[PDB]
Design a protein around this ligand. Structure first.
Ligand SMILES: CCCN(c1nc(-c2nc(N)cc(N)n2)cs1)c1cc(-c2ccc(S(=O)(=O)N3CCN(C)CC3)nc2)ccc1C
Ligand SMILES: CCCN(c1nc(-c2nc(N)cc(N)n2)cs1)c1cc(-c2ccc(S(=O)(=O)N3CCN(C)CC3)nc2)ccc1C
Ligand SMILES: O=c1ccn([C@@H]2O[C@H](COP(=O)(O)OP(=O)(O)O)[C@@H](O)[C@H]2O)c(=O)[nH]1
Ligand SMILES: O=c1ccn([C@@H]2O[C@H](COP(=O)(O)OP(=O)(O)O)[C@@H](O)[C@H]2O)c(=O)[nH]1
Ligand code: NA
Ligand code: NA
Lengths: 230, 230
């Protein structure tokens, strides 16, 4: 019938890609939209652009943050809309799991870059104006959020496990800042956003500090119970 | 009934703002969408952002070209859509004159900045991808184009008449480059674009080298004849 839209949120290396790849296999009624930035980490024009932008970002974040954030968010909206229009047309209970959302783009990542002076006030105000508009010009509004909650230390350890050379420099302090933002948005619900409906969207919080790759049935049971409430 | 969309195109200081302000007064069925960049040259968030971006552009175009071009084009689409949805609902023969278009944004200005190395290949490819997408996600497609054709020398003289301090440094060579692009697009129709319908859109070319402020009736007669053909 109508596709349920669920975003999977969480810190760097919390296990979102891992969890989403588990979910996709469990039901023909379940599909996933992987995060464009994750895929930037035969190549399409977007992958070539995104690999160049990520590389330049590691080199000079105060030059590239606005360009990166705008392209990442555009790429996400395009990919989410393509799945929403493309998939699950013959499903009985269709669910589309988004790996992160246009809200994590703005309120986690772009916000953090502005706070670190990697965007100036004009870049940040243009970005928010563009986001406010790019989102209204609607069908991507979330039915629920699944928060994969891990400690900064767990996420630092999982960056090490994943082994991308570019990321081994990421310090615990950066992960603690992103952790606080997620806790403010999704646990305390203190974060004010420009999207009124978000204060009321249901949120399922899953503790993923314990390795779940071979032992995920309890997490999936909580996902199925949560889905039945929507 | 259905609003006719006509873009007014031409080099810097050819007399577009002048012509559009003449047209708006002549018919209750005629409305105009002034160019956001022109208005950046009580202040809204967009005017504050746009004044800052223009100022930084004069200082360092190779840092600010991508940010400026994206914001100018967004601002234009927003303003054109607002007029298309807002105005001329009780008109018998409604016409909306756009001061320039999303096509002059990309194929005149952004293209020129890429050619001058003020955008690198990644910035230019991201911009074109964004434009290709930002335009499809449709109701702004043009019914006709009015080309206000002036020599670079006329336009250089009219920059002097207009007297904006920031512009007095603009050299003839820059105006000659923008002139060639307009002639390729609108006179020879040699310019290849990613918008197939544009090769076939009617174009009215008006020679505006002679001052028309007190003597514009022949130009308006050619506009009314052109409109009757659409
Ligand atoms: C794996 C993280 C990749 N990463 C980023 N990703 C995103 C992102 N944005 C989305 N919209 C979606 C999405 N999925 N991802 C935004 S930025 C990234 C981060 C840093 C970076 C390094 C170091 C510190 S810091 O805290 O040590 N510090 C340094 C000194 N000074 C400036 C203050 C801050 N901060 C950020 C540099 C490059 C990059 C690509
Ligand atoms: C009145 C023109 C304002 N102007 C511009 N406007 C637009 C624009 N874009 C739209 N999408 C819509 C729209 N309405 N306008 C784009 S750029 C602008 C132009 C220059 C500038 C100066 C000098 C030379 S140059 O040829 O002398 N040369 C210098 C050495 N080196 C780099 C090679 C080039 N080129 C550009 C610098 C700032 C600015 C704001
Ligand atoms: O229960 C888990 C969850 C994740 N990982 C590993 O932790 C790293 C990061 O996970 P992922 O890529 O899923 O994190 P994301 O950034 O997508 O949240 C990867 O090497 C995973 O194989 C793990 O070993 N056990
Ligand atoms: O027939 C004309 C057309 C224009 N102008 C002057 O030329 C300058 C630039 O015109 P406009 O602002 O209309 O140019 P645009 O950049 O909008 O094409 C202004 O000072 C106008 O008053 C003029 O004196 N006579
Ligand atoms: Na599936
Ligand atoms: Na009018």
């Amino acid at each position: 019938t109508r596709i349920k839209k669920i975003s999977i949120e969480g810190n760097i290396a919390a296990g979102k890609s891992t969890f989403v790849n588990i979910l996709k296999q469990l039901s023909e009624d379940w599909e996933v939209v992987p995060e464009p930035v994750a895929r930037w980490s035969e190549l399409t024009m977007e992958q070539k652009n995104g690999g160049n932008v990520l590389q330049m970002m590691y080199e000079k974040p105060e030059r590239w943050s606005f360009t990166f954030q705008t392209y990442a968010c555009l790429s996400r909206i395009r990919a989410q809309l393509a799945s929403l229009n493309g998939k699950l047309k013959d499903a009985e209970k269709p669910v589309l799991f988004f790996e992160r959302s246009v809200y994590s783009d703005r309120y986690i990542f772009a916000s953090n870059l502005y706070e670190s002076e990697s965007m100036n006030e004009t870049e940040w105000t243009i970005y928010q104006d563009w986001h406010d508009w790019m989102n209204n010009q609607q069908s991507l509004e979330l039915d629920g959020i699944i928060y994969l909650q891990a400690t900064p230390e767990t996420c630092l350890h999982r960056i090490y496990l994943r082994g991308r050379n570019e990321e081994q420099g990421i310090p615990l302090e950066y992960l603690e800042k992103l952790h606080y933002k997620h806790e403010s948005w999704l646990l305390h619900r203190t974060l004010k956003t420009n999207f009124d409906y978000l204060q009321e969207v249901p949120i399922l919080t899953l503790d993923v500090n314990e390795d779940f790759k071979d032992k995920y049935e309890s997490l999936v049971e909580k996902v199925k119970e949560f889905l039945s409430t929507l």
